[PDB]
Amino acid sequence: QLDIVIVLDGSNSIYPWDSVTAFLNDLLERMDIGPKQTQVGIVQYGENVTHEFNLNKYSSTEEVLVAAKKIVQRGGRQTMTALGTDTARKEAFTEARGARRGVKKVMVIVTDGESHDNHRLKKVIQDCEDENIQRFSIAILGSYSTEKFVEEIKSIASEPTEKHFFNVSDALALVTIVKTLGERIFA
Numbered sequence: 001q002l003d004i005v006i007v008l009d010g011s012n013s014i015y016p017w018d019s020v021t022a023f024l025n026d027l028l029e030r031m032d033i034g035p036k037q038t039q040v041g042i043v044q045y046g047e048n049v050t051h052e053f054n055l056n057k058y059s060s061t062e063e064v065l066v067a068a069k070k071i072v073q074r075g076g077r078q079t080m081t082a083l084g085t086d087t088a089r090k091e092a093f094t095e096a097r098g099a100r101r102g103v104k105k106v107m108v109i110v111t112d113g114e115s116h117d118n119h120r121l122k123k124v125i126q127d128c129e130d131e132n133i134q135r136f137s138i139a140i141l142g143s144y145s146t147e148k149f150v151e152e153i154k155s156i157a158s159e160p161t162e163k164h165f166f167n168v169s170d171a172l173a174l175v176t177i178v179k180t181l182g183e184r185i186f187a
């Protein structure tokens with residue numbers, strides 16, 4: 001079984017949001033979701049950090065797909081990637097939100113910029129590592145220094161980086177990595 005938490009940058013720079021929910025749809029529809037199968041929770045970060053839903057909120061794929069479609073962009077003026085990932089680690093992956101004893105933890109992080117809470121990102125990744133959270137990270141290169149941005153997001157991805165890290169040209173391109181992402185998550 002797998003407990004998957006998808007951690008989405010929902011700040012204003014992310015656009016169009018319908019591409020992000022499309023990526024959610026395409027990704028989730030490759031999964032059997034339920035209490036003895038895969039679970040998904042989703043965290044949105046920006047000016048707030050919000051649990052769109054918990055890991056144990058939904059017991060079928062059909063239910064998750066309907067929920068994901070109603071996730072709206074909550075906005076924000078900065079890239080709060082440290083805060084998002086840490087909130088996911090410390091809160092989404094808890095027993096009270098459906099994390100299952102002994103079940104492997106998996107995080108999928110999607111953003112388009114270098115983080116403004118950059119100082120503490122190394123610490124957050126360090127904690128995730130100690131808690132054996134497998135991390136997939138996705139950098140959206142163009143919005144409607146890229147190098148430092150890319151290397152930051154690469155640095156969130158688990159080893160091997162070549163399997164855990166993705167970059168795409170824009171939000172519309174997120175659906176194009178879903179198949180590979182899905183295969184890799186299930187190893």
Ligand SMILES: [Mg+2]
Pocket residue numbers: 011012013014076077078079113
């Ligand atoms: Mg932003």
